[PDB]
Amino acid sequence: GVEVEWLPLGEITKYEQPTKYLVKAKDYHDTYTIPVLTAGKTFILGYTNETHGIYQASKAPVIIFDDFTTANKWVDFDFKAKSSAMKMVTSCDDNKTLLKYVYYWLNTLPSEFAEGDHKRQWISNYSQKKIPIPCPDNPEKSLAIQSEIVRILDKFTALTAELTAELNMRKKQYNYYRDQLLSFKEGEVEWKTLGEIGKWYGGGTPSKNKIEFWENGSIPWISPKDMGRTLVDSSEDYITEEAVLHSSTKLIPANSIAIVVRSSILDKVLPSALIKVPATLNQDMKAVIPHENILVKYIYHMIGSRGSDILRAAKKTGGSVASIDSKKLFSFKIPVPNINEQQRIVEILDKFDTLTNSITEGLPREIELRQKQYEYYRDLLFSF
């Protein structure tokens, strides 16, 4: 880019409303075929593609979401749907734009487009101006010097895609590795009922009715709005050290685990967390400690490998917000092998999932750091 100039957005853009959409029959099952895409995560389940007035999403138009949001960008990669939120951004001239380029440029204005503040439509905002263009190099070598940077940005966007793909396949192979290995243990490994690994505690919950029990404090609070993590060391909520006068809690040791038994299972898969600070939890989850014939990671990952099995045999227990019972989660039996097969196999398993997961020695943290430097290298390149 020798002559870098600013150009208006609406000079080279046909921005329109979509065509006639008829996307709702009362089923959009997996057995359909079209990629259905909207804002947020760009994948709603499929729909019947043929004969609905479909725009069929040809080679390089792009889209924008949304009314009152005005932030989201996606490329219609090969052939996609038009599913009633996709306001179309494309070009009338295709000899200059090659509008994967304008996708590769347009994500570099966070000064106003990241401001969801009003119920305001903003057609003129991303309609008028600006964009960096190597004009007046058109059409000889305008996109030719942009070929290096479209190599850069195609390979970096492809890096983000393949990193998400390999993290998916890595967790896939690791999930089957949890269950091929460590199961059907022979022979014969002793079946220990849960709770006989250690005397575990019920819970305990105050309310916000006293401000003095809520404001300060150094004991963390484990609620299911901070759950779903691995190796929880702190939380967003801290409870007052005085407030265990009226908490109905017990001080649990510094190598406990915390498991949710309500609001997550009966529909989804329950997570679990090693909890390292002594922190109390509410009525509807369980703090489990091991005792003297154990290894806390082995019982942890034993429940974590068998999470889909402890939600099956006592699944319903009344059609309510109550779930898999306290006693019927208490009375499950796990293989507890000899003392050569606790620390070895959980050394393997702790090893491998602190490899595969968040945070430290983390593959997705590498992915978002590559996203950070992707934003920074687009910040560094697109100046003049």
Binding site: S111, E115, D117, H118, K119, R120, Y177, L181, I345, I348, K351, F352, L355, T360, E361, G362, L363, R365, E366, L369, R370, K372, Q373, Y376, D379, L380
Partner: protein, 473 residues
């Protein structure tokens, strides 16, 4: 704090035993009857006998009827009528509200106390329930004249629909002020409650006493509780009035006067059929607008009413919905006529919610017939103590800061400032766009965030190799 928790709780204890909106009329009526019973007695003793008698000597009776014009009796007050506990029948008090609202000499501000009614299912149950109401009002205890302040709490029963929270009202009162020690204050179209008028000059009574708090209000039952709302706070008799009716269709006073200060809080969605349904397209006041406001966007009718009743000394502090971009051609030229002159002075955004369930904030338009001239689009979202408003019940001392930086034409960062006088004619007459100063400003260093991930991947390769070895068990 002082006694407000106890008075708070005992006031909330009265609210049995069925739905509170209907009982609200009766509770406030009995409380107001208690207040007149204290006030008229404390007047006429001003000294020996608590318990009076029918010694009226009615040549004397016209003197407080001129002085107060709530001249009941000497044996028919709440101290006297609530000695008849569970006395058949009800209608004695309906007689005891008949005559003290007669008092036709002169300049009434009566025709008032007609909200206490009869339901009820059976007449014995009505007698028992009204005896319970007078019992509970007797149970309230003063123990020197802020006993009506609990009334200000009790009208806040629903707001914890439209009764204007108090510190925002204090802000609007400080915005109609200042630099104007001049008769008269004040005017209000669509007052609703008497609140946002009352917190103006109750703090400023020691400052000045000029003339009436002229208001006009639409709802019938709201009219009565407003007329007692400004009656409880020791405001005198002659000037201090509200007229019933629509402000738009039947305004009065036209003649008196172009005021010195108007405040308002027009309710949202107060539509009226136009445009116009009468021939008031060529009326006396909406002619400088050019076009006139349609049904559903009646809010900007009020501002066209606002610049009418206002002198060159005056200023107007009104509130509006935020959602003005240009509101179509129906209000684009209205916004144009507002920015045609130095009519609009400033605008102020607020913090959501700081109301009872909207959950949005609103804008405050400050208007004047006054010239400097550039606009200070003086928005704010924080601070604006957004966390609550329960702390600092007396004064936040925080709108103090807002008024202070409003006071002398500042240009502030991380807070709004002035803009150009023709920035908005470069805009499409918008409210607001400028300035909205650009918070959350962050970026990173070049390569500190990549070598750590590179080292973690060098750990990840030997972990892959340990994974390939350890798969054979």
């Amino acid at each position: 704090a002082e006694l407000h928790r106890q008075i708070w709780q005992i006031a909330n204890d009265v609210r049995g035993s069925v739905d509170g909106w209907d009982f609200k009329q009766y509770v406030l009526g009995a409380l107001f009857y208690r207040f007149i019973s204290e006030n008229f007695s404390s007047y006429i003793e001003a000294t020996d006998d608590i318990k009076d008698d029918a010694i009226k000597t009615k040549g004397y009776f016209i003197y407080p009827s001129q002085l107060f014009c709530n001249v009941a009796a000497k044996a028919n007050t709440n101290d006297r009528l609530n000695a008849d506990l569970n006395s058949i029948f009800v209608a004695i008090e309906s007689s005891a509200y008949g005559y003290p609202s007669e008092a036709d000499i002169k300049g009434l501000f009566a025709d008032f106390d007609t909200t206490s009614n009869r339901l009820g299912n059976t007449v014995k149950d009505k007698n028992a329930r009204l005896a319970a109401v007078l019992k509970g009002v007797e149970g309230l205890k003063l123990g020197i004249d802020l006993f009506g302040d609990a009334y200000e709490f009790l009208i806040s029963n629903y707001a914890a629909e439209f009764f204007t929270p108090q510190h925002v009202s204090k802000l609007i009162a400080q915005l109609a002020m200042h630099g104007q020690t001049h008769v008269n204050k004040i005017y209000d179209p669509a007052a609703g409650s008497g609140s946002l008028l009352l917190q103006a000059k109750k703090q400023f009574d020691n400052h000045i006493i000029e003339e009436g708090f002229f208001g006009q209000e639409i709802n019938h039952t709201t009219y009565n509780l407003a007329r007692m709302n400004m009656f409880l706070h020791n405001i005198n008799y002659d000037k201090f009035d509200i007229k019933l009716g629509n402000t738009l269709t039947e305004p009065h006073f036209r003649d008196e006067k172009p005021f010195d200060a108007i405040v308002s809080n027009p309710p949202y969605s107060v539509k009226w059929i136009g445009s116009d349904d009468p021939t008031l397209i060529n009326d006396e006041r909406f002619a400088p607008a050019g076009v006139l406001a349609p049904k559903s966007k009646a809010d900007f009718a009020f501002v066209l009413h606002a610049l009418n009743y206002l002198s060159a000394k005056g200023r107007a502090a009104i509130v509006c919905f935020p959602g003005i971009f240009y509101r179509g051609g129906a209000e684009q030229k209205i916004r144009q006529y507002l920015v045609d002159n130095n009519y609009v002075e400033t605008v102020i955004s607020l913090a959501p919610n700081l109301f009872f369930g909207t959950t949005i904030a609103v804008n405050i338009l400050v208007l004047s017939k006054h010239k400097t001239d550039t606009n200070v689009q003086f928005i704010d979202a924080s601070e604006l103590f957004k966390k609550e408003t329960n702390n600092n019940i007396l004064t936040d001392a925080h709108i103090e800061q807002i008024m202070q930086v409003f006071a002398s034409k500042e240009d502030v960062a991380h807070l709004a400032k002035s803009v150009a006088f023709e920035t908005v004619v470069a805009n499409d007459y918008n409210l607001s766009v400028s300035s909205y100063v650009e918070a959350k400003d962050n970026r990173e260093i070049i390569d500190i965030a990549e070598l750590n991930a590179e080292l973690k991947t060098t750990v990840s390769k030997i972990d892959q190799l340990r994974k390939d070895i350890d798969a054979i068990v």
